[PDB]
Amino acid sequence: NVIQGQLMSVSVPVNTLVVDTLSPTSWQASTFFVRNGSNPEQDPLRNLSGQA
Amino acid sequence: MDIKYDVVIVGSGPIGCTYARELVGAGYKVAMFDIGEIDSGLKIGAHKKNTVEYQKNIDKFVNVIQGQLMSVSVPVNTLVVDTLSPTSWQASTFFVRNGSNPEQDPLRNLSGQAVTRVVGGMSTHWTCATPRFDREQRPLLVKDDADADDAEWDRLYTKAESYFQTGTDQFKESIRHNLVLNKLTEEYKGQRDFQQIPLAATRRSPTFVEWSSANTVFDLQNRPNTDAPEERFNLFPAVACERVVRNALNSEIESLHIHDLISGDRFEIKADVYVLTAGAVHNTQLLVNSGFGQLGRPNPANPPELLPSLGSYITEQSLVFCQTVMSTELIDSVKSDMTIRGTPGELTYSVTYTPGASTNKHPDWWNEKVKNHMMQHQEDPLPIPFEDPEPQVTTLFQPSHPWHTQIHRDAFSYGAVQQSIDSRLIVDWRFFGRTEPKEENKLWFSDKITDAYNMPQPTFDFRFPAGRTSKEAEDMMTDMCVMSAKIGGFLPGSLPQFMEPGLVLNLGGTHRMGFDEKEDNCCVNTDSRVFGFKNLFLGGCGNIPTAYGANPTLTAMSLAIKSCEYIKQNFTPSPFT
Amino acid sequence: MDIKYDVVIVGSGPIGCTYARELVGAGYKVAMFDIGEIDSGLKIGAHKKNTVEYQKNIDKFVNVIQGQLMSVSVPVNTLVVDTLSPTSWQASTFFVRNGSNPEQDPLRNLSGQAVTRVVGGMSTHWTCATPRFDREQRPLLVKDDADADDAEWDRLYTKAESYFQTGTDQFKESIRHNLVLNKLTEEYKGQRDFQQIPLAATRRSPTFVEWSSANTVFDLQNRPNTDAPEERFNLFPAVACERVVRNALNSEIESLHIHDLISGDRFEIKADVYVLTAGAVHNTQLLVNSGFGQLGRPNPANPPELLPSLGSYITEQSLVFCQTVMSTELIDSVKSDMTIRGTPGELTYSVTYTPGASTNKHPDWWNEKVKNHMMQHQEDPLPIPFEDPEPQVTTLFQPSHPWHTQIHRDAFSYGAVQQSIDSRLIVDWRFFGRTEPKEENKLWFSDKITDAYNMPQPTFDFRFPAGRTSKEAEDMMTDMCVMSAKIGGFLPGSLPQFMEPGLVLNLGGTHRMGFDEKEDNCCVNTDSRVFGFKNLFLGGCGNIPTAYGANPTLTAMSLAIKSCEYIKQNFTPSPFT
Amino acid sequence: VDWRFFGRTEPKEENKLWFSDKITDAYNMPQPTFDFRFPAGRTSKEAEDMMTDMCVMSAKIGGFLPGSLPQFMEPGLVLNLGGTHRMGFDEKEDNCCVNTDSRV
Ligand SMILES: *Cc1cc2c(cc1C)nc1c(=O)[nH]c(=O)nc-1n2C[C@H](O)[C@H](O)[C@H](O)COP(=O)(O)OP(=O)(O)OC[C@H]1O[C@@H](n2cnc3c(N)ncnc32)[C@H](O)[C@@H]1O
Ligand SMILES: *Cc1cc2c(cc1C)nc1c(=O)[nH]c(=O)nc-1n2C[C@H](O)[C@H](O)[C@H](O)COP(=O)(O)OP(=O)(O)OC[C@H]1O[C@@H](n2cnc3c(N)ncnc32)[C@H](O)[C@@H]1O
After folding, report:
1. CA-CA-CA-CA torsion sign (B515, B521, B524, B528)
2. Where in the cell is it found (chain A) (predicted)?
3. Is the CA virtual torsion C342, C344, C348, C352 positive or negative?
């Protein structure tokens, strides 16, 4: 836990995971926009995703 | 096979079988085609859970369901796998892989939508809940005369109920059923009514319920035969129906083009009357492949010549689910009338009640069952008999609670932790919302991508409409949370949740019914006849143009019966040759 | 139902059907009973994956398998759920709940062991791998004469292979198949031989393989009929066979006691010859229910009067599994003979080869399929055709690698993340270990707990023996890790693993064969006749007394053929009157 | 017992750490971006050979613990990144940033 708590990811690609079980009243974007500190420059397939 | 029939039916689901029952019985020479195959035993198109093995191992049935539900539209997968060996081959893009549909926006899908290609269709696995729609949910059959409309619907529904063997008595003596029904009756006294879910089913024994199916409606046996020597019916399985051929005037269908999946041969089948009962998705596909509507991505700067409302105004219900573990109060109440003497497992253990006593909270039949269970199984900590049938409780859709409800048990895949909880404690909660028909909600078909049968690939463009539909959906979630708490707390791992869109499989309005094609934005009239066409009829949930929460099959069946009445008045059976 | 037959067979799996084929064909009046029901379509007892829909949606078939595998013995569940609402009822103990078996030590179980109760038994869903055993794995039929023993096996196995339609040719022009086969052949040149897995199956088209089943062996249609006007056979589904009645002398069976599950009535059926082919578990259960062996927990202080070795020396195979993702080198090698000009998607893109070129690594049929795929699907990044069949590769058991191998694809439920990997890249690895027969490894039956059909509850006492069995199992794991690396790296989510004990469903030795009841610690002789009994025969994998890694069904069928030769020489068919 | 085997990776010009001219990190500094694959050839072959070696060697001590089966870890989880500002004798000839005194 000490290790995980001080390793901050270097480059996180834009997340394209579909959540489709939200309530119909919850706000949803129409696209996978740049969210939550993700890096839109990052090709998810040419990354070091574990680099921290 | 002949090239010529009086009536050809595409699909052997319960709606196809309604046409077959009516029209075979009226003396028409009928052929029915199904892309799927016979696989329910000797009773063709029968319910697959009516084997002794599934009556004894109910939850294994969830595997049967899953094994015959094929996803309608799966978007391109973009999940990163970055723990492959450096030696393994990898593409540098998320390419079109594994039957995925590149037309599909993953954020405007019905991901849970699936289809069943077997003889008997989805009626070989369905839950068999067959409520009537109240006026608020129900399509109009007579305009500007509510009593005449009500009378027609009562007539049609009563017949549909007879065809399905719908009843509300099959679980009447279950302890768990009455424990739940009685508690909810009391809690909502003066506010809501509760009853048994109307079920298409016949009880055969204390531990066997024969669930209804396509086979209940029509046995699907070729005719003539010994029981029906004057009737004419052929079923042709493993035949893909690919299109109906329109005349140039768009006033008549000229033939049905079929692909025999075993031989590989293609034919034109000819009939006087063509009936499409291939389900809400595949009726639409067949029509679009026949030149109705528009192939490819919707183009409002270019609406289609024929049936411009086809595949628009599509509806799918919101579904919320949880499971609960019965309260200590309710469990203890089961044995409220008992006098319990001794300690369990010893010779001095006694469990007794006074039959008929006026201070008894339960009937004698209840107390006898509890007494016997408690005395015969003194190791068991619960007063509910081991073979006690499940609850099947509903409060039907009303304006102040505009959702259908099922408070019951069906086949479920319990996780290993969940199996730690005694199944007698567990109750399923399914609440179903109604969805407003909106023009922008669509089912369309690719002009480039094809499905596994080489037919134009179905693609959804769907979101739950803002406004009433969405508000009601969230209100419905809250309602399930409030009501379920009267019975017990949530079962971990089955916490209150919206199900993936389309998982509910109550899709409607893909080929919707109305009085006037233009004014009511519709595809078929109240006889289920395709506008403009003398001899083409559609059957199924796809005809339903309303926002409905209740399960739609009984209503679709009622519409098919009315359709058949028109057919009998307008087409003459061939003389039996 | 008649009261007397020449032969009664309990179970309609492939081994029951071997006795039916032999004995119905020989003119005997045969009855067959199955506790399960007809549910494979019109071809009674046929393979459920032979539908067009399952040939197009192959992975959905895992659901069919799961839906008809009922666990043999589930120990009491001790998993803690401590996040129930305070209002929910809870017991203070992990009491006997949900069909669990309180006799079962969870640490000495075959937890993956399961049974299938349907007409055709497990051959309705099996993988169809039918290798022969080499001498090392094979029970003796002739003592002290290796060449006679070899000759007898070859005869029997050859007939069995005709019954099952076993072949090694059905995947010969698969690119994926030959890609793997060739690579492993080269890697182990001089060390091991590779070939196609022998498969009970007939290819019908490039995209359809008709898998064999019990129906292949014997079609299960009542006789006499038009095709077999002088044969006599009746099949009685939904009949639980409960016991065989022994005479006072324990020299003859006098009747079969049955329970008709539909009517609920019990009857005694008379025959000259009684054959039990109810599977390794249920043969043993029926025997113990009939007074053979010992009911209850095994007890050396009180050994059984009849068949003291029944339910001892049981064997189950170790199974290890992974999946791989094809190496870049192998994928690139697929198109090694192509000259590729231009840019995909454009006018000038060109993929060509020179037919017959002496420098080509691949044959013309291969190069033609690759060329057409690459030219017709220029958006697709892989050279493997979309409809290319799966690999079906083995190196069979040998002393230097004493495990069976399958390097293939069968139906599998892929996770969402695994679905991200193109299916053409994926190969399944299954290695099967042999298990030494040990007296302490037992299948026994409770004298207090009953199963869902009210029969004594099966209980395992099993561990993989120390010594050779365990060392070989671990060596086998390492061998899979080494061999698989030649093809590609492991697929995440399907890393190398031992499967749950008994998930493999290759249980043997429960009613084992040998020459001398006492010396060979066995239950049946080499004619599959129960020792002491003139007219009682057992069929199936339970007869197999050896340590085997290869799939046992073909071997069990070969034993049943030899059994039928005995029966034909010692029992006279009734006159067809 | 834990088993961790660490492969060596050939330095290739195409494997890059670069910085966004538009996106910034939590300290408002140019956002790091990787362009990385394990090089074909020796690096990849040895990585897979390493995997097998772990499988073979570990079997001498015991079988795999369920839930910790032999696997490649997510790229960079190992946290042994090198060569981003690499040393050599001659800036051009050795394609490098610092000399053997670590001087730019
Ligand atoms: C799957 C399911 C469905 C279900 C349910 C629970 C489950 C898990 N619970 C229900 C409930 O409790 N009450 C209710 O009213 N319905 C419930 N359902 C849904 C119900 O099964 C369906 O609404 C009903 O079966 C629809 O009937 P219909 O006859 O219209 O359609 P189908 O059953 O899907 O049959 C269609 C068939 O036609 C075939 N087909 C498809 N395409 C073609 C082509 N091109 N050519 C020839 N035949 C075709 C199919 O193979 C099929 O059999
Ligand atoms: C499940 C399975 C099986 C399998 C396989 C893959 C799976 C997922 N792959 C195999 C393979 O590649 N090669 C091979 O050799 N075997 C493979 N198997 C196993 C194979 O299916 C079995 O070994 C085979 O089916 C055994 O045949 P057998 O005829 O001995 O037994 P059965 O198929 O289990 O059928 C037995 C039947 O008898 C009935 N029964 C049981 N109890 C009773 C009673 N009391 N009364 C009347 N009938 C009874 C069953 O219902 C059943 O049908």
Report:
1. negative
2. Periplasm
3. positive
> Of B345, B368, B388, which marks where a domain is finished?
B388
Residue with tokens 């002491």: C532
Among residues C388, C405, C420, the one where a domain terminates is: C388
d(CA B402, CA B410): 23
Write down the H helix ranges in D1-104: 42-59
Domain with B364 in it: 327-388
Decide: C545 and C437 in contact? Cβ < 8 Å: yes
Q: Which amino acids bring their CB within 6 angstroms of ligand 1?
A: B 10-16, 33-36, 65, 116-118, 121-123, 125-130, 240-241, 277-279, 282, 286, 505, 540-541, 551-553
Number of domains in chain C: 2
- C353 and C417 assigned to the same domain: no
Q: How many helices (H) and strands (E) does chain D have?
A: 1, 2
Q: For residue B16, which ligand has an atom nearest its CA?
A: 1
Residue of chain A minimizing CA distance to D26: A37
> Quick one: B265 and B217 in the same domain?
yes
B377-408 b/e with 16+ CB inside 10 Å = b? eeebbbbbbeebbbbbbbbbbeeebbbbbbbb
- Determine the distance from the C-alpha atom of residue C167 to the mean position of all C-alpha atoms in its chain, rounded to a whole number: 17
Q: Where are the alpha helices (DSSP H) in C188-321?
A: 214-217, 280-289
Rounded Cα distance between B517 and D75, Å, is: 59
Q: What residues have CB less than 8 Å from C11, skipping those under 6 apart?
A: C32, C33, C34, C121, C276, C277, C278, C279, C282
Same domain, C343 and C420: no
Is B200 marked as binding a ligand? no
Q: How far is the CA of C114 from the centre of ligand 2 (A)?
A: 10
Experimental method: X-ray
Q: Which of B18, B115, B122 to mutate to test the pocket of ligand 1 (most atoms within 8 A of CB)?
A: B122
DSSP secondary structure code for residue C225 in this structure? -
Give the experimental resolution in Å. 1.9
CATH label of the domain that carries residue C365: 3.30.1920.50
Residue closest to B73 by CA, chosen among B533, B475, B455, B520: B455
DSSP labels for chain A? -HHHHT---S--PPP------S-TTS---SS--S-TT--TT--TTS--TT--
CB-based contact B84 D73, cutoff 8 Å: no
Cis amide prior to B389 (ω within 30 degrees): no
| Residues C366 and C338: beta-carbon distance below 8 Å | no
